[PDB]
Amino acid sequence: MTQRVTRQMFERRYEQRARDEAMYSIYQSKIKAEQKDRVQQETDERSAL
Amino acid sequence: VREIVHIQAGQCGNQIGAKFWEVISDEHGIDPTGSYHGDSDLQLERINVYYNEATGGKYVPRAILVDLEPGTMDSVRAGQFGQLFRPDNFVFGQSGAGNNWAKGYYTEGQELCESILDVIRKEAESCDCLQGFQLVHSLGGGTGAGLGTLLLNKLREEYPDRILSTYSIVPSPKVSDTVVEPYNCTLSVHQLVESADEVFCIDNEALYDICFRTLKLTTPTYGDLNHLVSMVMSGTTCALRFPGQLNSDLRKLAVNLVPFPRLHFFIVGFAPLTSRGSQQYRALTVPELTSQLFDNKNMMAACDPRRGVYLTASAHFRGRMSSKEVDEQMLNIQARNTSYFVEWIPSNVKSAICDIPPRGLKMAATFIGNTTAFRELFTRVDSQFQKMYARRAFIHWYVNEGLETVEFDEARSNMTDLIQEYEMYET
Amino acid sequence: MREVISIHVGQAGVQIGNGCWELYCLEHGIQPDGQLPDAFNTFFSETGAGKHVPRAVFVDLEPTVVDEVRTGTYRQLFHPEQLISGKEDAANNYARGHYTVGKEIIDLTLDRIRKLADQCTGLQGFLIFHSFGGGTGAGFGSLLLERLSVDYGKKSKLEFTVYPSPQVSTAIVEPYNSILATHSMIDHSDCAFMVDNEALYDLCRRALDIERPTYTNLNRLIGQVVSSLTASLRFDGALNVDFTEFQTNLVPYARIHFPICSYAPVISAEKAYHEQLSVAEITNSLFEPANMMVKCDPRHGKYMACTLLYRGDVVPKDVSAAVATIKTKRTIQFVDWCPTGFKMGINYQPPTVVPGGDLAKVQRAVCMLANTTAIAEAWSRLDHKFDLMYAKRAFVHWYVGEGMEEAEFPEAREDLALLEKDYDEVAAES
Amino acid sequence: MREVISIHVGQAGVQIGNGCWELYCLEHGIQPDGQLPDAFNTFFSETGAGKHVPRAVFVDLEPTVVDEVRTGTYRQLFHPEQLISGKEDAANNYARGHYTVGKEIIDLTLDRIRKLADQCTGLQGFLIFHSFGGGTGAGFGSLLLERLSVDYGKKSKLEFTVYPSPQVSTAIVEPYNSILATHSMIDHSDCAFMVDNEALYDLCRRALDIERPTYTNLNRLIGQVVSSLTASLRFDGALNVDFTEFQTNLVPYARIHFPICSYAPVISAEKAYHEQLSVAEITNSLFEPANMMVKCDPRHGKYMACTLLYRGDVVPKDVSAAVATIKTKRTIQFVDWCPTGFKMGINYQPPTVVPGGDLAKVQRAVCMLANTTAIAEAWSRLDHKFDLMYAKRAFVHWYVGEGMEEAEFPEAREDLALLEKDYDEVAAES
Numbered sequence A: 001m002t003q004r005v006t007r008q009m010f011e012r013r014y015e016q017r018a019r020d021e022a023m024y025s026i027y028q029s030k031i032k033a034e035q036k037d038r039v040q041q042e043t044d045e046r047s048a049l
Numbered sequence B: 001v002r003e004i005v006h007i008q009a010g011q012c013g014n015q016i017g018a019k020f021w022e023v024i025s026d027e028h029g030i031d032p033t034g035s036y037h038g039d040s041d042l043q044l045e046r047i048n049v050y051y052n053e054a055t056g057g058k059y060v061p062r063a064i065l066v067d068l069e070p071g072t073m074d075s076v077r078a079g080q081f082g083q084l085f086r087p088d089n090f091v092f093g094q095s096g097a098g099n100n101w102a103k104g105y106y107t108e109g110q111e112l113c114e115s116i117l118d119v120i121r122k123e124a125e126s127c128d129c130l131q132g133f134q135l136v137h138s139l140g141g142g143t144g145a146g147l148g149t150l151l152l153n154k155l156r157e158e159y160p161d162r163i164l165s166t167y168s169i170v171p172s173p174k175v176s177d178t179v180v181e182p183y184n185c186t187l188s189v190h191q192l193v194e195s196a197d198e199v200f201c202i203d204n205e206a207l208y209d210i211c212f213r214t215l216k217l218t219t220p221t222y223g224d225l226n227h228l229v230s231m232v233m234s235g236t237t238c239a240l241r242f243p244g245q246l247n248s249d250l251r252k253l254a255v256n257l258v259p260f261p262r263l264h265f266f267i268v269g270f271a272p273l274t275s276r277g278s279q280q281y282r283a284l285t286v287p288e289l290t291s292q293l294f295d296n297k298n299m300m301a302a303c304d305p306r307r308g309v310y311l312t313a314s315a316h317f318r319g320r321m322s323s324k325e326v327d328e329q330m331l332n333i334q335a336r337n338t339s340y341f342v343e344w345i346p347s348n349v350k351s352a353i354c355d356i357p358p359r360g361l362k363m364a365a366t367f368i369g370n371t372t373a374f375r376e377l378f379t380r381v382d383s384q385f386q387k388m389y390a391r392r393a394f395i396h397w398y399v400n401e402g403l404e405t406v407e408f409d410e411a412r413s414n415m416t417d418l419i420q421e422y423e424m425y426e427t
Numbered sequence C, D: 001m002r003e004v005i006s007i008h009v010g011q012a013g014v015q016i017g018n019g020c021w022e023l024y025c026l027e028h029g030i031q032p033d034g035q036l037p038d039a040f041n042t043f044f045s046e047t048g049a050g051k052h053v054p055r056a057v058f059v060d061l062e063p064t065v066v067d068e069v070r071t072g073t074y075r076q077l078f079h080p081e082q083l084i085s086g087k088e089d090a091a092n093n094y095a096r097g098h099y100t101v102g103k104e105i106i107d108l109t110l111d112r113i114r115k116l117a118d119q120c121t122g123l124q125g126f127l128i129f130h131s132f133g134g135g136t137g138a139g140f141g142s143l144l145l146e147r148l149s150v151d152y153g154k155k156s157k158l159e160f161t162v163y164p165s166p167q168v169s170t171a172i173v174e175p176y177n178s179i180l181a182t183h184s185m186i187d188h189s190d191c192a193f194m195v196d197n198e199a200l201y202d203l204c205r206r207a208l209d210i211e212r213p214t215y216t217n218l219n220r221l222i223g224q225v226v227s228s229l230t231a232s233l234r235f236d237g238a239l240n241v242d243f244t245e246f247q248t249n250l251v252p253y254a255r256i257h258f259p260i261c262s263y264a265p266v267i268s269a270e271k272a273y274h275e276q277l278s279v280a281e282i283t284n285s286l287f288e289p290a291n292m293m294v295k296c297d298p299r300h301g302k303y304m305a306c307t308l309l310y311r312g313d314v315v316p317k318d319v320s321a322a323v324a325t326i327k328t329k330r331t332i333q334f335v336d337w338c339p340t341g342f343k344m345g346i347n348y349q350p351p352t353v354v355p356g357g358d359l360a361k362v363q364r365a366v367c368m369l370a371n372t373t374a375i376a377e378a379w380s381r382l383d384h385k386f387d388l389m390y391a392k393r394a395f396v397h398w399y400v401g402e403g404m405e406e407a408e409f410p411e412a413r414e415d416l417a418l419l420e421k422d423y424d425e426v427a428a429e430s
């Protein structure tokens, strides 16, 4: 029992970039956005200063 | 024990059937080559429900695959789990149906019906006790709708006692893949109203929305779309497959939910649904499941129940939980939203518990209910049907197959009666 | 398992057919000699040992075009019985190719097409190519359809023809051939697609990056459209569409079969490096008035039919979002009679590129087939052109002397007039 | 922290921007060299050393106007990349500025605009300037907005454009480019403000006492309006309004998004000493049609609602004592379905004067932005003018030759009629 699930392996391998790899970029960017959000608090504190 | 025969029709049915038997194999722990490599003796209690046993320690599922063209069958013949499927169970034609409902019913459905009925009878009389039939089909017109309703009638003639529970994917009423949907859907409902006992409606558009909002999938594949539907089917039959603190079979569901013979269409849903990342932070409890079950965004039917009112509601659970928690949650959700339930039916919420949860999730649930919100779907397809019938476009194909236009008026009259009945019972 | 058979009439059909079968052999991995260096049964047959044969027959009344295939590299593939060549062509005369000379070879051709269908069990469909301007293409196609209509009955007969261009022309008697052909296809043809060389030249120049295309490049573009249409029968997909599916969906009546074609992306092999061309990108490009291969105004043409065949890595949700976005456009007005108005076919097999070709290596592509009322614009142009010449009896003597009765001209004229009346009636609201 | 990007297209946009950035340099106290002799970050970037730099992009398809800034006094303030100049202008032709010449430079500017957004942490939206009659303002302006709609999506794209005057006209083809531009802005633009030169000429003569103004004087009055618009973002104030607060209150109705503008008190430096200029006085001056920046009478139609902005000494209760009297005026036609209609904004930074200016050192001032059905009067005049050209096809050949398809001419005409239907449908009552 190969041909459809092999196509499914091919089909999910192409979706793999719309899968997992979409998530690695967004959660890494969210982590960097937290480092950005905290310098926002630092810089708004500088503007408060 | 208490057996069920599974029938799959056409492109949509076979694809769902493949996913369904994947999940069922995972539940019971069946290696795709046929050997049992499970982990619990509890899987062996009611493995007879869905499977026959072949000599040499191999199990053959009670699955019959039906089509008019070999394209879907050649897709499933190597499938992924198809080595379980018996080679003689594969029945197929040599002609693309064309999705002409008259063609699929009279021209080619009749020729194949004799062969499918005998193949059905092979597994029907090979079980200690048949209890009901399971059918998966789409309301397209060629084989899922036309041939499916024909076999449903023939099985009703053969087995008046048994339960004909069919799963239906209605054409999506904003975007769907053929212009002849209003004709085929109108005729299919007409046959399904009288002959079927339980009809489950699932919409592709709501399936897309659930994947985005809850599953956070960038692009919903047909694979995961069929996976959610397979989970719903397995949860429905999980009570028969494993013990529980309060059991509920198909007949118990049918008697409880259906007040009147015609009004028996059902909306289904599943919980818990969680994204791949945030499942670690969730505190999954019974109130969490209840909130997800009654949430209007977890309903895989694109008909907001808040517009209408509820008539009956059912809840299934899988896992070890306290029965008082389930009872209190059902009472709270019933009393908190009295504006959405009929006054003349007290205790509108049914409950059920299963001992073993699905693999991967410590606790799970399934929601099936009946509401008057179905009036929107029928009205939408009726308005589409009215336009096409007024212009009498596309009807020459159906006339050439021998279907006379007076049959369309009967089908519309039946839907108008169903729409009126739903309207008056809301009061 | 499931089988298709093709017939090619005229040099336009043969040269288009030449390009198509090189496309299939590269797609299926078959050397020109016919041995491998699957879907094969749809188009090819295994002759034992290690050689294949195509399910095609090439017919023309002149030997030059057929002899070119006999002398070419692809001569080893084809069967000598499949190559049928006449002696003298119709000389751009419908009457000459219909009665005097077409009847000489019609019986021989019908034998070979029926004989090859005996080996072809799971059969549903025919593919026929025509050149409307040429006398042989229109005349022989009329007689061939008349015979095939009664010999086979309810069988899917689909044609891929070249419509005369609104201004570009190569024959002065072209309007006479087109109207007489239109009179016979309108009853004997289940559904036939047409393209015009004028828009093919225009698209090959603007979106594609060819300064001066020849017929070879245009044939390659046509072959890609054919390959996309037949992709469903050869490869698995999320939504496969059969020949019978197209016939039911595309037409709302009997005589309004004529669809129009659109293919995207059509970007060249050089400029395509810069664009990802997502689902939304290609979907929007299809409905551009410039991407049509028929020079018709979509503003005057309402839509009551559409078919969106995608090829490559495509997810159905993105199609659902793209189609929903398209429907919101006010400029693209569907008819009131067609709420849904869509067929979609998604297939996991990417398109194919040919060495020495002109198309880009696109990961995903979509071919479009729709029916619009704008085709009635072209019918008026042909009708007026026919009326101008027939008013003074420009070329009556040639057709009359070749066995055609004079009274057939008003009969076809009335047949075309009824077709235009039908288009106006159907397009009107109610 | 919170920032705005201003981009200018056409000669009108550039010289309007020249006046606006002159005002900002004086208001914040930044020398023309970029050094100092706060809210700076909203309009400027602190590059180190002692220098700042505006967040602006100047675009025109011809170097004359841009090189004036390059050779002008302010040249050291701007970044050389921000100044983008083409080779040859669009010649007041929409087709030339959109398809042929506009696409030669479109991707160069978008990189420049997007690069500025990278340094811009708290970006809110855009300010865009046009001249409807200009070829670059309309042809290139349409192409820029269509790209920016898909480049950024949910960002507030506000526009401030120069409309053709009711009778004063400098270009014959002005109605053609105006309507073709209207279709593009009406969908992609978030909101677009309205001003015209003819009303400016009358106001600059009556209220300000100038016999014979130039484009220089008109630009500075435009400069004050945009400063009061942005005052709530930059300086302190009890009530602030921004681009999630201006857009919703002012123009909610999907296609009714065209407001009108006004400013008060507008008075010469000689006479301003003799009045007291209470909040009641300046507020009453706004509602007179004579002060309208657009030569349309609100009495002809109905006020939908307004949006008033005060600066400087203004006291809160004084506003609500002045504006409560507005309802008592019968002539100010508020429909019953808009019952509140008076968004408020108060800022403590007074207006700023310019050397060689035309305004007085008024301690307090007010700006007005309202939508009214009276703007449908302006659209009717443009519509009637266009039909007179298009019935006899007065200028079609110029547009078609430059890549424009003729089918767009009725389509843009159709959209304007639908827009006119929208305004009349809004004027309906229940």
Ligand SMILES: Nc1nc2c(ncn2[C@@H]2O[C@H](COP(=O)(O)OP(=O)(O)OP(=O)(O)O)[C@@H](O)[C@H]2O)c(=O)[nH]1
Residues within 6 Å of the ligand: C009, C010, C011, C012, C013, C015, C016, C089, C090, C091, C092, C093, C131, C132, C133, C134, C135, C136, C137, C138, C162, C170, C171, C197, C215, C216, C218, C219
């Ligand atoms: N696109 C394209 N069109 C072609 C090609 N070859 C011929 N044509 C079309 O064919 C028409 C000329 O008629 P023929 O191709 O000779 O048709 P025929 O069946 O041979 O008819 P006769 O030659 O008159 O006997 C022209 O209008 C062309 O548009 C080709 O290679 N590519």
Ligand SMILES: Nc1nc2c(ncn2[C@@H]2O[C@H](COP(=O)(O)OP(=O)(O)OP(=O)(O)O)[C@@H](O)[C@H]2O)c(=O)[nH]1
Residues within 6 Å of the ligand: D009, D010, D011, D012, D013, D015, D016, D060, D061, D089, D090, D091, D092, D093, D131, D133, D134, D135, D136, D137, D138, D162, D170, D171, D197, D215, D216, D218, D219
């Ligand atoms: N109020 C005002 N209007 C201006 C000014 N400069 C140009 N305009 C308007 O601009 C219109 C002419 O178009 P252009 O100034 O050339 O704008 P454009 O988009 O660059 O047009 P092209 O030069 O053809 O590219 C005139 O009708 C004016 O109304 C100005 O300084 N003040």
Ligand SMILES: Nc1nc2c(ncn2[C@@H]2O[C@H](COP(=O)(O)OP(=O)(O)O)[C@@H](O)[C@H]2O)c(=O)[nH]1
Residues within 6 Å of the ligand: B009, B010, B011, B012, B013, B015, B016, B097, B099, B138, B139, B140, B141, B142, B143, B144, B145, B146, B169, B176, B177, B204, B222, B223, B225, B226, C238, C239
């Ligand atoms: N959810 C889901 N729907 C599918 C899938 N494949 C096909 N469909 C739907 O099934 C319908 C086609 O049904 P079909 O098998 O042709 O029925 P028939 O024409 O009566 O034989 C289409 O409208 C599809 O939207 C799938 O993998 N998942």
Ligand SMILES: [Mg+2]
Residues within 6 Å of the ligand: C010, C011, C062, C089, C134, C136
């Ligand atoms: Mg020839």
Ligand SMILES: [Mg+2]
Residues within 6 Å of the ligand: D010, D011, D060, D061, D062, D089, D090, D134, D135, D136, D137
């Ligand atoms: Mg200019």
